[model samples]
Target: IQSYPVERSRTIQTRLVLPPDTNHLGTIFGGKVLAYIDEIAALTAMKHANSAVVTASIDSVDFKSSATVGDALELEGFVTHTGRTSMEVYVRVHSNNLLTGERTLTTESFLTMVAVDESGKPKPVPQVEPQTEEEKRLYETAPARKENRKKRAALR
Candidate 1:
C-alpha cells in the first residue's frame, strides 16, 4: 500500500433540508443527519483507499444544534489515520440558515472504516500522512481512540 496525504481523502457534501427530512416540530431528525454523515464518511474512505470500504463503527456523535426546514446541511469528512486495513475518519456537520445567512456546527463524529476486496475480506490500505497542524493533532490522537474502541469491543 502507498502513503497518501490526508487531503487526498477530504470530501464535502451539502444537502437542503426539506419537509420530508424534518420531524414533527419541523426540525431535521437525528437519524437523517446520521445517514448523511455515514454516507459522507464512506465516500471519504473510498477516496482514500481506492477500493470498497465499509463502516466498522461510529465512535461518538454529539448533536450540538438543530436544523430546521429550508436550512442547508453541509457535511465534510476526511481520513485522519489509517491502519493496515482500517481507516479513522472525522466528520463535521454544519447547518446554515439560508434566509439569515447564519451557519452553525450541528454535529461531530468519528468513524472507523475497513477496506475490503471483492470477497469482502479486509485488505490493506494506504497510510494517511497529516499535512496541517490540526491534521497532525487528529492523527496523533487516533491511537487512543482506537484503544478505546478495543476496550469497548472487549466489553461487548
Candidate 2:
C-alpha cells in the first residue's frame, strides 16, 4: 500500500475523573485505564480507516504517575502510521487536577489495529495526510515502530 501524509489520520479522545474507579490506595486501577486505552484507540482507528477496525495488539504500557480517584484523566489517541491493512495508534493518558488544572503524563502505549470489511476480512485503507509538524514527525518516525513488531514476534 502507498503511504500517505499524517493530516489524513484522525484523533479520538475522552476524559474521565474518578473516585469510585480506583484501587485500595485510592489510585486509578491499571486495568481500568487500559480498558479506556483500548476503547479510545479503537475509536480513533475506525475514524482513520473509515470502516470497522479491530485491535490486534497493545504494546508495552508505561505508567509514569498515579492518578488519584478524583483526578481528571484525559485519554488521547492518534494514528501514528499505517500499513497495508493495519494502522498503529499512539495513545497518551494524562492526569490533571480538575480544580487546579495541573496536568501530568500518566501513561503511553501503541495500539495496532486492522481495518476490516463487511465479512471481517482485512481491507486496505486510503493514505493519510499529515499537515502539522507533530504529525509529520510521527510519520517520519515509522521506522521506530519496528521496535514493537520485534517484541510482538517474541510472544508468538
Candidate 3:
C-alpha cells in the first residue's frame, strides 16, 4: 500500500455562530460544534483514504470554552495515524471574536474513520507519515489510544 504525508489529509474550515445556532444561555450549542467537527473530520479522513469513509467512532471531545453568537468557529483537522482500513484524525477547534479579535480554544477531539467501497465493505487506506514534531508525537501515541478504544469497546 502507498503512504501519504499527514499534510495531504489536512483540512481547515470555519463556521459562524448565529442566534439560531446558540443555546438558551446564548453560547454555541455543543451539537452544532459537533456537526462541524464530524464534517471536517470526515473530509480529512476521505483525503487520506482517497475514497469514501465513515465515522467509526468519535472520541475525546472536550469543550474547553464557550463561543457566543457572532463568533467564528475555526476547525483544523489532520490525520494522525492509519490502520489497514482506518485513519485517526485530530481536530482542534477555536472560537474567534470578530469584533474583539480574541480567540480561544473551544474544543478538541479525535475521530476514527474507516474507508469503504460503494458496497460499504472496508477497504485499504494509505498509511500516514508525520511531517512535524507535533504530528510525530501524535503518531507515536496513536497505538495506545487505539488500544484504549478497544478496551472501552470490550466493556460495552
Candidate 4:
C-alpha cells in the first residue's frame, strides 16, 4: 500500500457491542456497521485533505461477513483516489478477537467524500500521489471506479 502525506492510510475504529446496535436476528445491525464505515472514511479523507470532508456518496458496500454480539469492530481506510475536491476512500472492517489475537475481514466499501471550507462551500483538496507500483495501479483504476459510481448513481 502507498500512503500520501506519508501517514494517511492508518485508521482506527472502535465500537462497543450494544443491544440497540443489534438486529432482530441477534447480529449487529448492518446500518450500525455502515455508520462506522462512513465515519472512518471521513476521518481518513480529512487526514489527507486537512479540511472537513463530507460524504458526497457511497459507491458500494460488500458485507463479506456478519458480526455478532461481543465482537469488536475496527476499520482501516486508505485513499485510493483524490480529485479536485473529492476523495475516494476504500476501507476494510475487521473483527478483532481480543482473546485469541485473531482478525477477520468482515466488510469492505468504496466511499466518496468532498472537502468543505468554513462557509460549507466545497473546496479543492490535495491530490494523492501514488508512490509505488501498486499505488500506481490503484490510481490508474480510479477512473473506472468513478465511472462505475456514476453508473450506480443513475440507478438510484
Candidate 5:
C-alpha cells in the first residue's frame, strides 16, 4: 500500500451548541458528541483511504469536561495508525465560550474505521507516517491497542 503523511488525513469541524442539544443540566448529551466523533472519524479515514469508510469500533471515548449551550464546539480528527484494512482515528473535541473565548478540552476519542468497497467488505487502506510527537506517540501505541482489543474481545 502507499504511504502518506499523517497531516494528509487531518480533518476539523466546528459547531455551535444549541438549546435542543442540551439536557436539563444545561450540558450536551454524550450521544451527541458520539455523533460528532463518528462523522469526523469517517471523514479522516476516508481521506486516508480515498474511498468509502465505516466505523468498526469506538475504541475509547473520554468526556473530560462538558460543553453547554451557546458554546462553540470544535472537533478535529486525524488518522493516527493504519493496518492492512483498517485505520485508527483520533478525535478531540473542544468547547469555547463565545463570551470570553476561553476553550476547554471537553472530549477525546479513538475510533477504528475500515475501508469498504461497494459491497461493504473491508478493503486495503494506505499506510501513514507520523511527522509530529503527538502523531508519533499515537502511532507507537497502535500495536498495544490492537493487542488489547483482541485480548479483551476474546475474554468476552
Candidate 6:
C-alpha cells in the first residue's frame, strides 16, 4: 500500500580483485562476480521490501569486459520496478584497473526477488517509483523483461 522510490534502496559496494578470485586465465571468475551481483541485489530488494525475500531468477547477466588482478570491482544495485510480490533489481558492475588507471564497465545483471514470509508464502510489496531518467528507463523495460521470464518459464 506504500510506494518507495528507486533511490530508497540503491546500493553500491566495492571489492578488490585478488589472486584467489581468478581462474587459470588470471581473470576474475565469472561465478565469483555473479555472487557479488546476487548479494548486492538481495540487499537492494530487502531494503525496498522491508521484509525477507528470496531470489526467483537471475534473468540476465552480461559480461561486457574482464577484470583482472589489481582491479577494483564496483557493484551497484537498486530496485527498478515491482509487481505484487516480485521486485526486479538491476545491478551494474565496473572494474577499475589500478595499474593502468582505467575503468571499464564489466558486467550488468537483472534479478527477480520475491517477498516472502516465515511460511515462505509470497507477500505483497510496495510499488517502486522511478525517480531519475536512468531509473525510469529501467522501470519501463522491466515488464517486457518479465514477460520474457514467463515465456522461458513455460518453456522450462
**Per-residue accuracy of model 2 over 1-156 as CA lDDT, tens digit each:** 455555455554555656667877868888888999888888888877889999987766898986886687888788877778978888889988888888999999887889999999999976665778887887788767767677668995
* Residue pair clashes in candidate 5: none
Q: Tell me model 1's lDDT, rounded to 2 decimals.
A: 0.93
What C-alpha lDDT does candidate 4 achieve relative to the native structure? 0.81
Q: Estimated TM-score per prediction? A: 0.95, 0.86, 0.96, 0.84, 0.96, 0.95
Error of 5 at 94 (Å): 0.6
lDDT tens string, model 4, 1-156? 323642455577776567888999967889989989888898888888888888998888998877777778877787888777888888888877677777788898988889999989889877777676866787889999898877877785
Q: What CA root-mean-square deviation does each model show from the true structure? A: 1.1, 2.4, 1.0, 3.2, 1.0, 1.2
| lDDT against the true structure, each candidate | 0.93, 0.79, 0.92, 0.81, 0.91, 0.91
Q: Which 10 consecutive positions of candidate 6 have the poorest summed lDDT?
A: 147-156
Model 5, 1-156: lDDT tens per residue? Answer: 599999999999999999888877879988898988999998999988999998898888988998999999999999988888999999999999989989999999988999999999999988999999988999998999989888888784
Task: Flag regions of model 3 displaced more than 4 Å.
Answer: none
Q: Which is the leading candidate under lDDT?
A: 1
- Residue 91, model 3: lDDT of 95
Off by over 4 Å in 4: 1-3, 100-102, 131-136
**What TM-score does candidate 1 get on C-alpha atoms?**
0.95
lDDT of 1 by residue, 1-156 (tens): 589998899999989999999988869999999999999999999999999989999999999988999999989899999887999999999999989999999999999999999999999999999999999999988899999888988894
Native-structure RMSD, model 6: 1.2
Judging by lDDT, tell me the better candidate of 1 and 6: 1
Between candidates 5 and 6, name the one with more favorable TM-score: 5
- Residue 16 in model 6: shift from native, Å? 0.7
* Superposed model 6: Cα runs more than 4 Å off: none
